[PDB]
């Protein structure tokens, strides 16, 4: 006799798996529809002896394999699980190594801008609601982050290889993150139209784009105003365990001690190249693989990162 099945495993989210006995003679997908081993498409190959015992992922194709997708990725984008699998079976093939004491990517794939994002994500008091973020940034961590890599991408709406951008990407990836306690509260003056006080949560609450200088949001910034006036802003109030401050690219001094992380953007609107700086016993400029440890540092920034717990302002009436 020779093996006419074998008992494998189908699974949406790496946990709940599911008891499937194979026909050897019909593709996976002529059994589950399209199916993943490894990140590996194989819809259109037969079974192996040597599969037996083994997980493959599949797409969710009734209400309890639904259910446990949604749980897991928290998005119902049916699309998703096929665009993670496809950029995974390129991100197992990275490298990962530790740089300056944090998880880096050897460059591949045009993914510096990926590299910058899990090397800021590292350093931000951040944990993410969706469990399959939550349980692969717990593993790049250590240095396994081909599973990280992977959802960021499918997240983002981005594919291996293509061009991409960190603040983009941080503002798919923080829908997904501990953010519903964290609070903003701006004072805002027109000379028009008057005072108001705007009160932001969440994402919006982490994320600003205008300048780089968490300083400036708190004495004052210029902001376009609905009549056509530049009005002025400050920050009366935040609760976050970080923010995120960015800015068309431009020349900027960091000084260690003064900020948390920032990203370097070497580029035009055309095309740009992102390099990740923090510190440890001094300045560390990250690009991928490669280490300069510097002493100081001007040059063109687009994102930089400063730790919170609470702020009041200082400033009067
Ligand atoms: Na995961
Ligand atoms: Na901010
Ligand atoms: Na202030
Ligand atoms: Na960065
Ligand atoms: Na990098
Ligand atoms: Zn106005």
């Given amino acids: 006799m020779e093996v006419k099945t074998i008992k494998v495993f189908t699974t949406v989210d790496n946990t709940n798996l599911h008891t499937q006995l194979v026909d050897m003679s019909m593709t996976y997908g002529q059994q589950f529809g399209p199916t993943?081993?490894?990140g590996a498409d194989v819809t259109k190959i037969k079974p192996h002896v040597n599969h037996e015992?083994?997980?493959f992922f599949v797409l969710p194709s009734d209400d309890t394999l639904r259910s446990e997708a949604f749980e897991y990725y928290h998005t119902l984008d049916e699309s998703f699980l096929g665009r993670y699998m496809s950029a995974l079976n390129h991100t197992k093939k990275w490298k990962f190594p530790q740089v300056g004491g944090l998880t880096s990517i050897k460059w591949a794939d045009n993914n510096c801008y990926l590299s910058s994002v899990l090397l800021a994500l590292q350093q931000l008091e951040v944990k993410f609601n969706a469990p399959a973020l939550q349980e692969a940034y717990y593993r790049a961590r250590a240095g396994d982050?081909?599973?990280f890599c992977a959802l960021i991408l499918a997240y983002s709406n981005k594919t291996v290889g293509e061009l991409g951008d960190?603040?983009?990407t941080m503002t798919h990836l923080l829908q997904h993150a501990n953010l519903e306690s964290a609070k903003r509260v701006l004072?805002?003056?027109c000379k028009h139209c008057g005072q108001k006080t705007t009160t932001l949560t969440g994402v919006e609450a982490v994320m600003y784009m205008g300048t780089l200088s968490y300083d400036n949001l708190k004495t004052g910034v210029s902001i376009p105003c609905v009549c056509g006036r530049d009005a002025t802003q400050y920050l009366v109030q935040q609760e976050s365990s970080f923010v995120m401050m960015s800015a068309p690219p431009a020349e900027y001094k960091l000084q260690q001690g003064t900020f948390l992380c920032a990203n370097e953007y070497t580029g035009?609107?055309?095309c740009g190249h992102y390099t990740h700086i923090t510190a440890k016993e001094t300045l560390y400029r990250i690009d991928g693989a490669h280490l300069t440890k510097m002493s100081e540092y001007?040059?063109?920034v687009t994102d930089?990162?400063?730790?919170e717990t609470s702020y009041t302002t200082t400033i009067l009436e």
């Fill in 53 to 55: 015992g083994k997980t």
């Fill in 298 to 300: 001007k040059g063109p």
């Fill in 187 to 189: 004072n805002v003056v």
């Fill in 145 to 147: 982050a081909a599973n």
């Fill in 304 to 307: 930089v990162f400063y730790k």
């Fill in 166 to 168: 960190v603040r983009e």
């Fill in 36 to 38: 993943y081993l490894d």
């Fill in 268 to 270: 035009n609107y055309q």
